[model samples]
Target: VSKGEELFTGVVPILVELDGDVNGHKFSVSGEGEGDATYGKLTLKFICTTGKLPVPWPTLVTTLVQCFSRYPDHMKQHDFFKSAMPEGYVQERTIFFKDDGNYKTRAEVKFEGDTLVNRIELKGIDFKEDGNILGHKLEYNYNSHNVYIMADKQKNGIKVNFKIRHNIEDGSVQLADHYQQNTPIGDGPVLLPDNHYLSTQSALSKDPNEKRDHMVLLEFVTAAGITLGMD
Candidate 1:
């Protein structure tokens, strides 16, 4: 019944609680010695729950269908990923909306794993009727990335925005994945410079004790403003 062990055990559980666990797992914190700061560094690991309810998590495909269907044209024009497509592949393209001067285009795609790793060069051509505005081509890495087409409204029409890509370290469209949206997405989900709360597809739920298990390796960081990268 040492004092240090008791205190460590008591407070450490709270941190674990915020992070949640993967499945219905148990937390085990281990260290040796005693005193105010006895251990040099602390590490945590979990054991799986034999039988538990599965948390609702979206696959890469499910996410694209919900949020990405909004934009289509800009996504189809992307040339960087074509080489990744197989020798003979088929695609279904659709345009969501076009009115006044605004429009959106998208292409539904299915490809082998090899095409997923293809990197393509993208060039931004603002006015391509006679010549392109940005002459240089930008090299892109999309082999392991998922694409999301995006748009915003303008006076004449909508502006064709971006082809968003996501991986583990980064995802173009942020979903809780396992995290919950605490406040309104219009509130602040991802912290920013202007302190504007997160909006759009952001969400928050109870960050169950199980989150730690699933997202044990997930780290949250704050960023200012959002960018739909084209380069």
Candidate 2:
């Protein structure tokens, strides 16, 4: 009979036992390997488990809903993204809280994708008066604005601080589509920017592996929350 050391070629079996969490999920591993430094055979038992019981893993829908379902609801006038509406559309004809002291004037905005508010609804002279310090989003491309706001455009307005006075906020109020050369927008626009950039409504334009097939009970009952986006 050959000696164990001789048959093993001076190699021994390696053993490992571990249990821990990975990014909030728990997992345990047990493996046995016998070989030399160059190569060998290994048998491993790797089991991954979640914190929740009965249901092995939370579904992607549940995970996404639990973490990303929150809408931005705390914004106020003059604050960033304040004009963003519930359905990802920007509010139209938003009147600023502060007024221009020189004429007791104020700024109003026709945010992007508002589908356009008619002059009749403006009701006040602000549209025709110097009391108007409004900034309308004309278009946007990539990371800047040129006018006509929407989600893409409105997002920039919040960043640029549309129409409010310096004391109130910061932004430009150009009557025409302010083209600091990004004269952007299209699809419905057919308008062009200096370069081919992404616009609010046009222009151009990680994640991880999850055991999505093995969804939890809520996922099964809710049918992966497909209805959550049916609207």
Candidate 3:
């Protein structure tokens, strides 16, 4: 089909199998992708309710992080959604990490004050050494029993797929953290329902001068044996 003749289309189902290890626990995940015929977009979704299958009442603990780009120096923030966004409308900015090995990277979901609602963390992980990667992007979603970590990077990028079933009673999603506080860094924060719509809407909106700050996605955490089930 010629580029100019690219028409007629149908639904395409995308399925990805996830398998990996955290510290020492084994885990597996099955991600099913759905697409809309009108927009021709595909989205992968994994919910906690029936999306995760692990050892019942499993017991184990480990740490992990869903990292986008990890720059050690000369990091700058660009409006990835520039053509369709305002200054700093989306926060997928470049992430800078300290090489001192003392920097603490964290992502949290909280209510009001210091009341942290929940978190998902991966321990013993760090940013890729400076000048080691590019075009990196990360995305995810979580629930009481599962969390999904996805990314796109040139080199040393985080490419993972798995289901997390923590002590549903009281375990937080603990992914790794970076040096700087949570900010925009790559493809922007939690992607909206249909990214095509969000960007397109912003692009065709009446007020071209409209702008907004970036947003952050949070994951709650606690200390309990987690069942990092593998497929």
Candidate 4:
């Protein structure tokens, strides 16, 4: 086939099969050519009840908040919907951290009086100085059970009874507040979800644009934890 076409020496086709359903999307992808996994899988998805975005754009939380801010109730209504989104929702932007240390990040959920309603955080530790790590104590204060819920959502898909249990490490004392979905396994009390998606593999790819921020896919499991894009 290469002789019929123009065969290139250093070029190849890398086909990746994704196996999992996260937030309800079956995921699999093949690169335009080989070694595509290095470019990231195209399976990562935004967290939404809807199948796709209302509009193709960057920064979902920011764009949605802004859109709702300008054209209130353009879409359907929900009891959970806010009458007025917080300033941060329109002001501060979230830098999706894939393990960027420094704990120097925030999300714009909402505003309650003067406090950012969804603004609670943990202290990050960067002892190695190697970067690419986001080690932090399990410190938490705002909405403890939600942390448990998020963790359980990924873990056993069941809620945990937070009776303030103690966790004895390999043989060390852990002295910090911890949260779920963000904490590492083993060295903590609660464990996060391993394969919320029934399938084992994940694939990813990116669509980057100056007009739109780069988009990457995790291409994992669903709320029920099944192989995505499959029955």
Candidate 5:
């Protein structure tokens, strides 16, 4: 085939999976050379979900040129939608400790009000009973590890009590937390000795702009037999 002579054209699927979402598209592809040795261009249309910003010629040139230079992972990490987004569009980000596994997740508890234990998850034997949690203790003997969880609801948010034994020589470390309507997950009794304390803040690749002051939560237990007793 001569220069750009191969009539290689088709529409193929393009799927992009991000940490928080996924985008799929199919577009026309025009290339040169044979199907096996094709090299050309993909015609993709990106509709502006928000207002369009003024694209100075220099930046536009740099942007188009960089498309050839950068890799897909580099692109996925960029928040393109935020460039010209409308007002009140906060990608109110989420942090997740779920990935950096330190201690295995033993349980998550959410309280009702001042004295009731509502939602709970046990590693093995879970109880769905809503009761005024005080002295009651639930034992979760998963993997033959001695783990116990106690919870309480308070005027603050939720009271957390834990009795975790790390038989880590051949045992698994544990994690548990208590939460309520008035508080987020970090505002509860929790356990996470493995993380050494970390945050699940969203991923960012670019040099950050001046963001407003925000609350960052680091929810991990530093000590065993932890209790959040504030009468």
Candidate 6:
């Protein structure tokens, strides 16, 4: 038996529980640590349940389809990519909406493993028209949704991260990517700035009434890049 005030050394168990919803997907995650913080094994379990694809998630998929259809065999009018396309080369292209008064946006994309990578460029006759806007990357497994958009060159080459989401009834035509505070297990905390969660919805479509155009964007990214009228 140990007496009172006896020196003792022990380890505290670490446990975490997280549950939330992104768009319409419901997810719950839990983790337990066995042993000390310095040398311990952590067991983690995550369960995410989602029905049909939501707004921006589907937007990424739809853009992929449109990119390929327009640039059959990776043939784009601008010729942004340096790599050549092979017959049935499994490459694609798509045009994204941008609200820069004098600029247009287009994306060149490819599948690296199961991930879809897009390099969206901004072009305008007034300027050099050869600048990139963002790296809209989406990586998923089966029916899971894991996506991110990275802006490497911001106002002055600053970096930023954003998680995309879309609310059709939100009544704002701004480019909006909601900000999120990040805390990784066994890692430091992160708080992003307002710019991190930006809104570019307006750049995508001028009129909210154009539900069909938005739907076409979704279809273009998700499956095939069939050309849809911008009516």
Question: Per-prediction TM-score, please?
Answer: 0.18, 0.16, 0.23, 0.22, 0.14, 0.20
- Full-model lDDT, candidate 2: 0.21
Report the Cα lDDT for residue 179, model 2.
15
Give RMSD to native, each candidate: 22.4, 27.9, 20.3, 20.9, 25.4, 21.7
Flag regions of model 2 displaced more than 4 Å. Answer: 1-9, 38-231
Show model 1 residue runs off by greater than 4 Å: 1-46, 51-220, 226-231
Error of 4 at 184 (Å): 24
Error of 2 at 114 (Å): 74
Clashes of each: 32, 9, 41, 22, 2, 25
lDDT of each: 0.20, 0.21, 0.24, 0.24, 0.18, 0.24
Q: Of the candidates numbered 4 and 5, which has the greater lDDT value?
A: 4
Choose the strongest candidate by TM-score: 3
Tens-digit lDDT track of model 1 for 91-155:
22221111101111122222233221111111111222211111111111122222232221121
lDDT of 2 by residue, 38-61 (tens): 122222121223323211121011
* Alpha carbon lDDT at 37, candidate 1: 13
For model 3, state the Cα shift of residue 35 in Å: 2.0
Better of 2 and 6 by lDDT: 6
* Model 1 TM-score, 2 decimals: 0.18
Candidate order by decreasing TM-score: 3, 4, 6, 1, 2, 5
List, residue by residue over 58-138, the lDDT tens digit for candidate 4: 212111111111111221121011222222221222222233222222323343443222332222323233322212222
